[PDB]
Design a protein around this ligand. Structure first.
Ligand SMILES: CCCCCCCC(=O)SCCNC(=O)CCNC(=O)[C@H](O)C(C)(C)COP(=O)(O)OP(=O)(O)OC[C@H]1O[C@@H](n2cnc3c(N)ncnc32)[C@H](O)[C@@H]1OP(=O)(O)O
Lengths: 368, 366
């Protein structure tokens, strides 16, 4: 009671990569690969590589384009990763820089300042370093006093973070700043036509406070769920060096088929049980802010929740423009469309993805 | 009514002593200074200095430490454990250690997988980004509910306890909190300044809503962070895209700056916390402090509890384990918690990288 999301903030890099640009880049690296290894392809010693097309990506997912930290390196067939430069310890890290920009916007939108925040949580799928925590770096650049920590549960990091924010407020925090910084172009495999299009880069932020006097989305119910799966996995980590690792699995890897069939009914079951628990029907939900990876999966989830007459008219899509931004996607959607909910109406925020993790949150808008 | 009701501890088998560690580093430096005698006389590469086991012990109180794999750390040509990649079908090393510790803590609390709602992995370094290894631990124990990874380096256990407590206040019955610290994967064994500081370990804790189980009731928590670059490791998933070359992808610290900054800070936090609780230092039977440096702990004790305070009020396990980062306070509480009788007070207090400090006032119940 009285715990509300009172502000959100969005930052994305300026450069954009269209599906067509992405497919042309992959197709060049494929052509080049199949040439240099024409021999061992004929002997079966090496796998022939397949390409893709803008049309396949868009029908596969709904994605048309994405923002990226740096465009030329990702598209260069001889690199296929952003062109970045080490910063010194004296300057803001990349992850902390993006986080600060999104955070400042959430704070202005909530009408709060640095002295009003007690907790900073950096919740996302990959931290730029292990220590000092990037959340502490964000906290300091913003001049916030209190404490901060980094939290990783990949696709549901934002809903899990909202829960942790609610718990900390319930026990005494005044206001929590929750930050999601996803530089997915840093761990994506741009050589793989099945995953190279899925992800884009972004940072989002949220202000969560105890209040009855500020406009926001009041949290009514949270359900969090994990169930270990290896269908999404990235084995990059600090022990690779000691393992003298050689397996080529240190980037995002996935069995998209299995993920689709496992997670869609799982998410739907969680949402339906949550709605029944709250004595609401699908028809009482003004907006579903679902994970933003695959428009076809979301459409199927609403069929399981709101009948086979279902439909995305109340389930906004931002993945056409952002692609999949992992933990940040639900927050992007809420940022862009929360204004379409009226005073007193209900919405549902639901993350789902790697780990298998699922976070589902029932909110109600209040206007002060 | 929320209590820490069990703790568990796993350490690997092999022991490395100050002597072996100094000989191994001394052999590297003699060998490095041998191949580069030119550029050290021609002022291009610096002439490496060695270390002494006598220095290590008096600087910190550390004598030995457990390690995941001994031979590769001591090998002056490698200076890092010899591990092998496991396939996804196998339990990861970090999950394996956390499971072993978790079962012991579950046993000591009289609890089964059924009884647990949340699993938190809270340590200084995660083996991988996704799927969370806390989820891997959760599934290996058969626990149902949710799990997540959380990193605040040295204070990850006190921060995790706060998070466990807050989750119970919101509806969780029981939380399993795990701290797995394979520091040999990110310690710099070439660096005389820090190669002796860290050991490997895993700890676990059960936190429950209860008034009828023996354990430590959590009474007050003060968490604090303040960005400092005085402890930093720049390894990360963007190094590949930065085409990184700076030799800072391992543990680095300015230990004496850390000492001056953090020691008075910890004592100010504890004193204010005691005042808030309307306790005095005399009311605290055991201070479970971060297990990094015995001199630092000695100074913090004699500042909060006065000169003449018995040093047995601040138990030390860093002599056997070296610095274990987030797990240090949990080891100490595990090994000397029985030393606190019913109705007596304790203080758990971790501190370190990030500058993080976390401090918890507890009371024993039997
Ligand atoms: C694995 C990472 C997990 C991530 C978790 C990170 C969070 C944490 O747990 S933080 C833990 C790190 N440390 C702390 O919290 C406490 C901070 N302070 C310390 O640890 C101590 O200062 C410690 C043990 C490093 C050294 O203590 P101290 O005696 O003050 O060393 P220092 O003053 O720097 O050295 C002075 C002299 O000794 C020399 N010296 C330094 N190292 C050595 C050595 N190995 N052998 C011989 N001499 C040495 C110095 O070069 C110098 O030489 P001289 O003055 O004669 O020219």
């Amino acid at each position: 009671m009285g715990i509300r999301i009172t502000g959100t903030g969005l930052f994305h890099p300026t450069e954009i990569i269209s599906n067509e640009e992405l497919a042309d880049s992959l197709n060049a690296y494929v052509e080049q690969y199949n040439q240099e290894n024409a021999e061992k392809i004929a002997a079966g010693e090496l796998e022939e590589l397949r390409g893709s097309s803008a049309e396949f990506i868009e029908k596969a997912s709904g994605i048309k384009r994405r923002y990226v930290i740096e465009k030329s390196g990702i598209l260069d067939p001889t690199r296929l990763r952003p062109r970045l430069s080490e910063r010194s310890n004296d300057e803001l890290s990349i992850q902390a820089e993006w986080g600060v920009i999104a955070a400042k916007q959430a704070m202005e939108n909530a009408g709060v300042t640095a002295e009003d925040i007690d907790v900073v949580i950096l919740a996302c799928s990959n931290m730029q370093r292990a220590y000092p925590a990037v959340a502490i770096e964000i906290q300091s650049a913003l001049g916030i006093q209190g404490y901060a920590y980094d939290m990783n549960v990949a696709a549901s990091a934002a809903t899990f973070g909202l829960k942790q924010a609610a718990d900390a407020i319930r026990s005494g925090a005044r206001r929590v700043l929750l930050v999601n910084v996803e530089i997915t172009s840093g761990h994506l495999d741009y050589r793989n036509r099945d995953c190279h299009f899925i992800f884009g880069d972004v940072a989002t932020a949220s202000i969560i406070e105890e209040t009855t006097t500020k406009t926001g989305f009041e949290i009514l119910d949270i359900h969090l769920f994990t169930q270990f799966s290896n269908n999404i996995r990235n084995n990059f980590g600090f022990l690779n060096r000691s393992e003298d690792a050689v397996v080529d699995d240190k980037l995002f890897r996935q069995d998209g088929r299995k993920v689709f069939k496992d997670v869609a009914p799982l998410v739907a079951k969680i949402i339906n049980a949550q709605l029944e628990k709250m004595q609401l029907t699908a028809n009482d939900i003004k907006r579903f802010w679902l994970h933003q990876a695959n428009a076809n999966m979301n459409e199927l989830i609403l069929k399981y929740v709101a009948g086979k007459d279902a439909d995305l008219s109340r389930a906004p899509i931002i993945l056409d423009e952002f692609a999949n931004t992992s933990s940040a996607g639900v927050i992007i959607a809420l940022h862009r469309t929360g204004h379409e909910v009226d005073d007193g109406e209900y919405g549902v925020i639901s993350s789902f993805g790697a780990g298998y993790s699922v976070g589902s949150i029932v909110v109600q808008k209040h206007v002060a």
